[PDB]
Design an enzyme around this catalytic site. Structure first.
Site, short mmCIF file in Angstrom:
data_model
loop_
_atom_site.label_atom_id
_atom_site.label_comp_id
_atom_site.label_asym_id
_atom_site.label_seq_id
_atom_site.Cartn_x
_atom_site.Cartn_y
_atom_site.Cartn_z
N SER A 175 -7.62 0.16 12.29
CA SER A 175 -6.25 0.64 12.05
C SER A 175 -5.38 0.57 13.31
CB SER A 175 -6.26 2.08 11.51
OG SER A 175 -6.26 2.18 10.10
N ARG A 204 -12.38 12.12 3.47
CA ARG A 204 -11.68 11.14 2.64
C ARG A 204 -12.66 10.31 1.84
NH1 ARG A 204 -7.98 8.48 7.22
NH2 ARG A 204 -10.06 8.45 8.25
N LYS A 235 -0.92 -0.72 5.80
CA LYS A 235 -1.39 -1.96 6.47
C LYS A 235 -1.73 -3.04 5.36
CE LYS A 235 -2.81 -0.10 10.99
NZ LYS A 235 -2.30 1.25 10.91
N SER A 267 -1.54 4.54 7.46
CA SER A 267 -2.23 3.26 7.67
C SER A 267 -2.50 2.52 6.36
CB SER A 267 -3.55 3.45 8.43
OG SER A 267 -3.39 4.11 9.69
#
Ligand SMILES: [Cl-]
Lengths: 242, 242
Positions: free
Chosen positions: A95, A227, A50, A47
């Protein structure tokens, strides 16, 4: 002039994980990472693609502006946030892969290829489905390459309109308060091993900017929130944020 | 189109304060206030004038971009954050009056007047010193007029470039998280009675925008923080923010 800080591996081990965090002090033109080798290992972007995908779709007019609505196609998918209409802002926030697949098809294989070569984006290889190569095709990027791309987006130096870059940086807004702003994008690559999580972006201070790119092994979705939490522990350790 | 909600008076009373909150639901095209009379009372804008002032300085090239540095003129002032160099982002954040006074002198009387007329900004009357009329000159604006101006800014409908408007809206970023984004500007008018505090801007949600303009009596500096606090209590009460 990169510098290695193995102290940071503590944050990965405590979380029963392995990964890399890379930081770049813009003022000092000086980089820091826990793992110089993994910092340069290139993976699927998932993602985090993006960012360039949005930039291209705006500059080519496939997306008119951050308000244009792209309606649900009616197929129920597992992520409920995807089962609704979206704009660029919410498409990025949640997302919404399908909205960006439609963008990729309208951009077309050839325009996608030229633009990613213009960006010097990773290995610049879009081999695979026009509408899935950043999940299971040939494109690959490292944490340090993420930083380099992000630095050009930040300075509006990419070869798309300034407006395109402003809108995407708006759409990347994740967190802001009186101490810092974070513009960033998450990523989770699951289709091709090794399964990894990404977080790339930057932190704006009053008088400096700190870019970051991190990825980490992510065999199960249970650790997706690490993350951000590990990156923020490193930023805290280094006094970048409180 | 403009309904009254007197239950919001409880938030002023509990904070030993007096003022108005005006809200506008963009989707429903409907406004709400605790005090219709005071919502249309016009006051000096004080630092809320930094929104139109920035737009004008940008479109005319007095300000090249959000990164250009305006160096401290060496004169120490009592507000320590003013005694350093600044760009547009941080001049807005710290409401650095002298940087904006220099913008205004470079804009000049005649350009300032004609472009404020183009914005239909309050009473459009810049009588006084070009570099302080928004603190002690003849310009007056009401909370409902802040709303009207802000809505144009949001939609890029003011008669300046889209880029100027995008930059100023970036410079207005105050708070952002996974629930909402707040773009806003404080103000504090002391030079002419009645002394008051302002907070104007908006809350971006996934699917709606809520504009807000509040002002409140401020006989002393000690209640400044209540400009934000009282506004947030109304937003919480209306379930715009958690
Ligand atoms: Cl922004």
């Amino acid at each position: 002039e990169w510098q290695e800080n193995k102290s940071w591996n503590a944050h990965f081990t405590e979380h029963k994980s392995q990964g890399v965090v890379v930081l770049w002090n813009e003022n000092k033109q000086q980089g820091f990472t826990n793992n110089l080798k993994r910092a340069n290992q290139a993976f699927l972007p998932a993602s985090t693609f993006k960012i360039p995908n949005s930039l291209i779709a705006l500059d080519l007019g496939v997306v008119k502006d951050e308000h244009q609505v792209f309606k649900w196609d009616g197929q129920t998918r597992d992520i409920a946030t995807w089962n609704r209409d979206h704009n660029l802002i919410t498409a990025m926030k949640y997302s919404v892969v399908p909205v960006y697949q439609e963008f990729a098809r309208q951009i077309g294989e050839a325009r996608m290829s030229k633009m990613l070569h213009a960006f010097d984006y990773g290995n610049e290889d879009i081999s695979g489905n026009v509408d899935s190569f950043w999940l299971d095709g040939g494109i690959r990027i490292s944490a340090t390459e993420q930083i380099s791309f992000l630095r050009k987006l930040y300075h509006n130096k990419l070869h798309v309109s300034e407006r395109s870059q402003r809108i995407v940086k708006q759409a990347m807004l994740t967190e802001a308060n009186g101490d810092y702003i974070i513009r960033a994008k998450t990523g989770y690559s699951t289709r091709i091993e090794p399964k990894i999580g990404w977080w790339v972006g930057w932190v704006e201070l009053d008088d400096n900017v700190w870019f970051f790119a991190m990825n980490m092994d992510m065999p199960t979705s249970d650790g997706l929130g690490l993350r951000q939490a590990i990156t923020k522990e490193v930023l805290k350790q280094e006094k970048i944020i409180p």
